Ligand binder design. Structure first.
Ligand SMILES: CCc1cn(Cc2ccc(F)c(C(=O)N3CCN(CC)[C@H](CCO)C3)c2)c(=O)[nH]c1=O
Length: 352
């Protein structure tokens, strides 16, 4: 039992990422019946089948089919994924809002299954630290960034300047800044290295999703998933406001620690949109979608970190009139266009 020699912040990141109990709390959060469907019985093909029902609902809504099939499909969904709503009525699956809500849950279920499968697979060695074994499963080089360097100064300033006044429920404190290097991702990203308009953007996610996020990278919703469950289609979503992405950590009062990503995203030509557009492909010659937000990080204060633009400017009006987005959103539809650079441990201080 050789005790791990990894730095203490990296060891804590490993423990927090592979926490089986956190995976169970996330499933209870969705009111999933863990007695009828324990974490060990959660299956990949089960999740894709549930995605198919969501897509079947989407098509039934789109042709008028009949709302009673939609009733049957909704009941079929709750049979496939056993829930426990105690005495209340389970939410019906008859409108686009409920399809998005269940697609989001399946997104988290998909990454939770990947994490658990990682843990219970491969090899195990009694003489090895579980932290050391779980670290190697991530297939990622993780190094703690020195607090006093210019990387951390830029990253801290990115956090400090782009917390929107709208997201007033909490404030953010940077605990740890990690430099991350997924195996093979640098080679995969090379075909996009010298594309224009490369920005450093945030991606917030639930803590449980990060075992899959680090082992497999950011992925696109599977083909079974309904394209109308996502505002701008089935792509990878980023933000330039740290608080916009931190909201997608789903941090609570009982679990105030969150994980957020800083990724280099090859945006190229930007299909600028102001409202929903459930697309699967992009128009020829366009490399990403930008949701136009009312507030944008002041473009006068942009800096370059390793030839990548960092929109750490404070929030100002964008001049866009008829848009449905409070803040900007960046979406790519090819996973090769993303190169993950930094991983942040954030403490959420909720104001009460
Ligand atoms: C605006 C910034 C922001 C938004 N949203 C919401 C959101 C909405 C629709 C989306 F398609 C995705 C997204 O990118 N997905 C969907 C889930 N997963 C399916 C395989 C993937 C995850 C990586 O494996 C890819 C994310 C976050 O969650 N975080 C953020 O920072």
């Amino acid at each position: 039992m050789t005790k791990s020699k990894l730095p203490k912040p990296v060891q804590d990141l490993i423990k927090m990422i592979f926490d089986v109990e956190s995976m169970k709390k996330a499933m209870v959060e969705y009111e999933i019946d863990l007695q009828k469907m324990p974490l060990g019985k959660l299956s990949k093909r089960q999740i894709q089948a549930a995605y198919s029902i969501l897509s079947e609902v989407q098509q039934a809504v789109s042709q008028g089919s009949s709302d009673s099939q939609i009733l049957d499909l909704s009941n079929r969904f709750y049979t496939l994924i056993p829930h426990d709503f105690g005495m209340k009525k389970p939410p019906l699956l008859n409108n686009a809002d409920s399809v998005q809500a269940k697609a989001e849950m399946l997104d988290n279920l998909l990454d939770i299954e990947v994490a658990y499968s990682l843990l219970r697979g491969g090899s195990d060695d009694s003489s090895k630290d579980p932290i050391d074994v779980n670290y190697e499963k991530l297939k990622t080089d993780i190094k703690v960034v020195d607090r006093d360097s210019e990387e951390a100064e830029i990253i801290r300033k990115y956090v400090k300047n782009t917390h929107a006044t709208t997201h007033n429920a909490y404030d953010l404190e940077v605990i740890d800044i990690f430099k991350i290097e997924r195996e093979g991702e640098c080679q995969r990203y090379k075909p996009f290295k010298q594309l224009h308009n490369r920005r450093l953007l945030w991606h917030g996610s639930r803590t449980t999703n990060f075992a899959g996020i680090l082992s497999q990278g950011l992925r696109i919703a599977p083909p079974e998933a309904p394209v109308t469950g996502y505002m701008f289609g089935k792509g990878i979503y980023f933000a330039d406001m740290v608080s916009k992405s931190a909201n997608y950590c789903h941090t609570s009062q009982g679990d105030p620690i969150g994980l957020i990503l800083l990724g280099e995203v090859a945006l190229g030509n930007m299909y600028e949109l102001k409202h929903a557009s459930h697309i699967s492909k992009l128009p020829k010659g366009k490399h990403s979608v930008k949701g136009l937000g009312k507030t944008t990080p002041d473009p006068s204060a942009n800096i370059s970190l390793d030839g990548v633009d960092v929109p750490l400017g404070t929030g100002i009006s964008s001049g866009v009139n008829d848009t449905s987005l409070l803040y900007n959103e960046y979406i790519v539809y090819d996973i090769a266009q993303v190169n993950l650079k930094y991983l942040l441990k954030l403490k959420f201080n909720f104001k009460t």
